[PDB]
């Protein structure tokens, strides 16, 4: 059973966003399991599962803890506006390939 | 390299029982006797000057 801890929750009205640091705790598990972590984050906060996102995962030595960077949006459309395209390729729906020449 | 020094130290501390007399740990059980002999002629003590 994974365990979740949010810390230092601030609000960004300019980016319509709420951001925090994510202490993810998995004793006798491998690692963070980021999609399941987005599920757990989207249910501890409000619904917006295609508007919650995590990117900066570092597991400490020997496992157990990992610190990530969590940012949760309202309004999935403006989340699609404000998130970068590589994270949208990683998690959500966007896929535009670069033209392979030279 | 580790097992060689484990087995040349066991050889060395088996040779040390030959040159000195090593304190093995005191009286184990009942004092059975000297088990190896008593020499009444030999004196293994360091005389001064």
């Amino acid at each position: 059973a994974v365990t979740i801890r949010t810390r230092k929750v601030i609000s960004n009205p300019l980016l319509a966003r709420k951001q925090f640091v994510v202490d993810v705790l998995h004793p006798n598990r491998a690692n963070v399991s980021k999609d399941e972590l987005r599920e757990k984050l989207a249910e501890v906060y409000k619904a917006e599962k295609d508007a919650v996102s995590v990117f900066g995962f570092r597991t400490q030595f020997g496992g157990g803890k990992s610190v990530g960077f969590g940012l949760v949006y309202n309004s999935v459309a403006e989340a699609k506006k404000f998130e970068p395209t590589y994270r949208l390729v990683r998690y959500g729906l966007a896929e535009k390939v670069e033209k392979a020449s030279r | 390299s580790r097992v060689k020094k484990r087995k040349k130290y066991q050889k060395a501390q088996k040779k040390l029982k030959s040159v000195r007399a090593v304190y093995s740990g005191g009286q184990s059980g009942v004092y059975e006797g000297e088990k190896t002999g008593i020499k009444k002629g030999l004196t293994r003590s360091v005389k001064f000057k």
């Binding site: 365990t3 929750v9 157990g64 | -």
Partner: protein, 454 residues
Amino acid sequence: NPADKRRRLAKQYLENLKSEDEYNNFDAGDLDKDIIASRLKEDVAEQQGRVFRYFGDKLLISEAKQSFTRVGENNLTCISCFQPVRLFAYTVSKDLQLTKYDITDFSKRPKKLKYAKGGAKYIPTSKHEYENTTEGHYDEILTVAASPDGKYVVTGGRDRKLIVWSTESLSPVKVIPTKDRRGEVLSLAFRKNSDQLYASCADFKIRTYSINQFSQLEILYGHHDIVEDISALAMERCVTVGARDRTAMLWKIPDETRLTFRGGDEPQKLLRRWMKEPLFFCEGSIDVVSMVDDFHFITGSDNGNICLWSLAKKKPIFTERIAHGILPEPSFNDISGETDEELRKRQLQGKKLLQPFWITSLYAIPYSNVFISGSWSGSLKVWKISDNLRSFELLGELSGAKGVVTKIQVVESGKHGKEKFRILASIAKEHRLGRWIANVSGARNGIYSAVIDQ
């Protein structure tokens, strides 16, 4: 003078480091971080709460309604209580039984509701340290802890298990073993208004759990003897005390760092301090804690000390040397075995083998001005801490509790200026860890409740 030169050179050093009040005094980085402070959320859990309940001299002391409800369980060990924002209490014994009480009928003795008794039936069929997932206690339940929300009680003892029982039925919902051979739990404390438990296990270890997720958060290491007591408040700090290493540590649990506080009273300098014009001495083992607020706490020792410690001083702020008396010396018909009283008196060596009572229970009411100490002197003591927070002082005694006091805690009633509390104290005739206790002087295994007023 070498220490004078050390102090002088350290002062010059700090002056030089400063080298490398006006009308304008504003610093850009400080005010930017204060803008981020105005931007952030969650001013809820992390209150550095000071002492906001100044009521020590206010309430009455000497005429409490003291009911010592004796129960038929050998050597009660712990007491857990609960208040929402009807009140239940919990006791547990060395006879492997947990017992639920109702306590909310305030003017009278508590009411038994439900047993939950483990026994020899719950010994595991393996003797293997990770299939310890049975549903009951087979050895020596040492501590209970009620949830701050009241869904669960969680208990554990020398069978190295944490069994979490539901409240409404006293049923084991989940078993969490501590996965090693010496992993006996000795103290449990929820952080206040939460679902997070801090257990202190004799592996020099502190385990943390989230109970409603059935998960373990963090194991944190660092004491040097068994972690005999634990204490927590609404902050994610914690305060533990290991027994014989004579240090109390407090843990930033997310950072996994600590502040250590050693003791350090010596009878040489103490008897010299008295010699400037006396039976007091060094320290055995720091035993019990309770965090009074988020800047101070108090420790109960093995030589009867009660000490008051701040968050900003290694050495303690205040001591109180003898807090429950010195024990009655062993009689001349039970020391020597000679015939004459002169030689049987010579076998007492005067005053050299008088040993003090050791405080085996201490409870600070959270953020309040008053704490309660208990041992087998027969009389609980009530102390209030002065409003400048650099001393405490004995208010009164509660003398209706014959036996060892294995647990003290209080139950609140009344509003902001008019209040009444019932002090529960588990009373046994045997210390909560080993036996060690002779001269059982009229003790009984009961619950000493007192109703204090105003």
